[PDB]
Structures are given as structure tokens and as C-alpha cells.
C-alpha atoms as a PDB file:
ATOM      1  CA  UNK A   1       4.304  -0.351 -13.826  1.00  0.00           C
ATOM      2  CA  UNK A   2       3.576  -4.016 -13.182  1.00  0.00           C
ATOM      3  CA  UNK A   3       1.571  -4.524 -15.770  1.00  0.00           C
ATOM      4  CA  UNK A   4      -1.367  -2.727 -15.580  1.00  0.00           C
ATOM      5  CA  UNK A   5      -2.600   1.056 -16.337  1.00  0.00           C
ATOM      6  CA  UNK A   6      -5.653   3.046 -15.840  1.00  0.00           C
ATOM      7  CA  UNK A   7      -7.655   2.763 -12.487  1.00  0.00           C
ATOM      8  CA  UNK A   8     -10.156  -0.436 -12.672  1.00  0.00           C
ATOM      9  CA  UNK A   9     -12.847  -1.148 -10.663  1.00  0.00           C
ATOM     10  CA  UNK A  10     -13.222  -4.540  -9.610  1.00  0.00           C
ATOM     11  CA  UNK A  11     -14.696  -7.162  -7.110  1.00  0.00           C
ATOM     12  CA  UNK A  12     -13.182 -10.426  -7.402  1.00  0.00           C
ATOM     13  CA  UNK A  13     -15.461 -12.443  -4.786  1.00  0.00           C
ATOM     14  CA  UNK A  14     -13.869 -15.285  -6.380  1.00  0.00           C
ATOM     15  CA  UNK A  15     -10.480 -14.462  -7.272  1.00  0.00           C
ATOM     16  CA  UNK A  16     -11.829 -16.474 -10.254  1.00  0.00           C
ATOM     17  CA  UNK A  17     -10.333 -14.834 -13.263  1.00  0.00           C
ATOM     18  CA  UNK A  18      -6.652 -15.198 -10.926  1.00  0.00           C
ATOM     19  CA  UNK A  19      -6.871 -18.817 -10.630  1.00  0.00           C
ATOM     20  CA  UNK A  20      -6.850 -19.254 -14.945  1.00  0.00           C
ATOM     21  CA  UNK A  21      -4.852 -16.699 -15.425  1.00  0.00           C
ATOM     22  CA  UNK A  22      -1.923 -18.370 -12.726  1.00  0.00           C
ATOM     23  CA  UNK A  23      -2.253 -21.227 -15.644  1.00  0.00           C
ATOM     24  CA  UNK A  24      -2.299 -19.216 -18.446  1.00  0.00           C
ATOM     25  CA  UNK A  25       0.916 -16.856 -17.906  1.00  0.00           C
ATOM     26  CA  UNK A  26       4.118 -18.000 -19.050  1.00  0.00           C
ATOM     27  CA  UNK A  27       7.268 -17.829 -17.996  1.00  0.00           C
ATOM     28  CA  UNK A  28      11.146 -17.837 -19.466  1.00  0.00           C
ATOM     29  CA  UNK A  29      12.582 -15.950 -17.263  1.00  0.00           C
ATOM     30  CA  UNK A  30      12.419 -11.837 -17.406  1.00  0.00           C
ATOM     31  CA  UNK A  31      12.184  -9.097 -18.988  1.00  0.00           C
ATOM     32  CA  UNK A  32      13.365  -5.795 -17.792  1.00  0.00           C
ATOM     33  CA  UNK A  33      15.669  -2.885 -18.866  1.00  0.00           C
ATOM     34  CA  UNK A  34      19.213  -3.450 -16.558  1.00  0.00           C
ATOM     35  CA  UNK A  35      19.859   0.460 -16.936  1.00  0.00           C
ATOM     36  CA  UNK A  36      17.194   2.574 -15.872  1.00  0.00           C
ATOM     37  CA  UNK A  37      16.895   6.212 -17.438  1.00  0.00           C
ATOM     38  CA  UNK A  38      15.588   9.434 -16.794  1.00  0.00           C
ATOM     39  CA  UNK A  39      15.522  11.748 -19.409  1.00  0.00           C
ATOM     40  CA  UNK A  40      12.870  11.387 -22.309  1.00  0.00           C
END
């Protein structure tokens, strides 16, 4: 999971919607869980 769920269709003839978002993300610098598990 990157982060994105359920299958979207979508033709990006510009990669318009890309080139704002590339601006609009924002960094610090991760976040992600060091230990992965498996139950649940």
C-alpha cells in the first residue's frame, strides 16, 4: 500500500493533476512502522 486503494480508472494525457500535486506534497522525512507484523 503506497497510498492508494480501490482500482481507478484513469487517463492522464497530461500527467496534469501529477505536476500540482509534485508541489503540493510535503515532506519531513517518513513515516513507516520499523517492525512489520503478521497476526491481526
Amino acid at each position: 500500500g503506497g497510498m492508494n486503494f480501490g482500482a481507478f480508472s484513469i487517463n492522464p494525457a497530461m500527467m496534469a493533476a501529477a505536476q500540482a500535486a509534485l508541489q503540493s506534497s510535503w515532506g519531513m522525512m517518513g513515516m513507516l512502522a520499523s517492525q512489520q507484523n503478521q497476526s491481526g
